[PDB]
Amino acid sequence: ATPFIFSEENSALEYFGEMLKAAGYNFYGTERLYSGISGLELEADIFIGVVYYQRLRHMVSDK
Amino acid sequence: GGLTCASAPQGTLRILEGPQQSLSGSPLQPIPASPPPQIPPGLRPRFCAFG
């Protein structure tokens, strides 16, 4: 994810959507979910993925 | 028998030592530009549906 490595001509979304479509998923990164409460396939297909979360040092236990 | 002022100099020479410029080649980088990130060949799906 180095800055300034992907231009307007070579886009990042194009690159990673091709990567995804090469794995059987869809270009735009949306997979369609079901509702865990009603059990029905939601009408909109959701955008899901893997992101890196940090946990901050500020906790309600200290404030 | 003493030293007297003589005629004013007619000119001055100033010497300095200087080397010269080479041709402009402008060789910017060993491996140049920002080489683009790219597709691993073939890849293949690493996941299948159930059923």
From Swiss-Prot, chain A:
It is linked to Treacher Collins syndrome 4: A form of Treacher Collins syndrome, a disorder of craniofacial development. Treacher Collins syndrome is characterized by a combination of bilateral downward slanting of the palpebral fissures, colobomas of the lower eyelids with a paucity of eyelashes medial to the defect, hypoplasia of the facial bones, cleft palate, malformation of the external ears, atresia of the external auditory canals, and bilateral conductive hearing loss. TCS4 inheritance pattern is autosomal dominant. Belongs to the RNA polymerase beta chain family. The chain holds residues 947 to 1009 of 1135 of the full protein. It is found in: Nucleus, Nucleolus; Chromosome. The active site comprises the fork loops, the loops and the rudder that stabilize the transcription bubble and assist polymerase translocation. It comes from Homo sapiens (Human). Component of the RNA polymerase I (Pol I) complex consisting of 13 subunits: a ten-subunit catalytic core composed of POLR1A/RPA1, POLR1B/RPA2, POLR1C/RPAC1, POLR1D/RPAC2, POLR1H/RPA12, POLR2E/RPABC1, POLR2F/RPABC2, POLR2H/RPABC3, POLR2K/RPABC4 and POLR2L/RPABC5; a mobile stalk subunit POLR1F/RPA43 protruding from the core and additional subunits homologous to general transcription factors POLR1E/RPA49 and POLR1G/RPA34. Part of Pol I pre-initiation complex (PIC), in which Pol I core assembles with RRN3 and promoter-bound UTBF and SL1/TIF-IB complex. Catalytic core component of RNA polymerase I (Pol I), a DNA-dependent RNA polymerase which synthesizes ribosomal RNA precursors using the four ribonucleoside triphosphates as substrates. Transcribes 47S pre-rRNAs from multicopy rRNA gene clusters, giving rise to 5.8S, 18S and 28S ribosomal RNAs. Pol I-mediated transcription cycle proceeds through transcription initiation, transcription elongation and transcription termination stages. Disulfide bonds: none annotated. The gene is POLR1B. This is DNA-directed RNA polymerase I subunit RPA2.
From Swiss-Prot, chain B:
The modification Phosphoserine is found at residues 26, 34. It is found in: Nucleus, Nucleolus; Chromosome. Residues 18-41 are annotated as: Disordered. Residues 29-41 have a biased composition (Pro residues). Component of the RNA polymerase I (Pol I) complex consisting of 13 subunits: a ten-subunit catalytic core composed of POLR1A/RPA1, POLR1B/RPA2, POLR1C/RPAC1, POLR1D/RPAC2, POLR1H/RPA12, POLR2E/RPABC1, POLR2F/RPABC2, POLR2H/RPABC3, POLR2K/RPABC4 and POLR2L/RPABC5; a mobile stalk subunit POLR1F/RPA43 protruding from the core and additional subunits homologous to general transcription factors POLR1E/RPA49 and POLR1G/RPA34. Forms a heterodimer with POLR1E/RPA49. Part of Pol I pre-initiation complex (PIC), in which Pol I core assembles with RRN3 and promoter-bound UTBF and SL1/TIF-IB complex. It is in an antisense orientation to and overlaps the gene of the DNA repair enzyme ERCC1. This gene overlap is conserved in mouse, suggesting an important biological function. Component of RNA polymerase I (Pol I), a DNA-dependent RNA polymerase which synthesizes ribosomal RNA precursors using the four ribonucleoside triphosphates as substrates. Involved in UBTF-activated transcription, presumably at a step following PIC formation. This is DNA-directed RNA polymerase I subunit RPA34. It comes from Homo sapiens (Human). The gene is POLR1G. The chain holds residues 103 to 153 of 510 of the full protein.
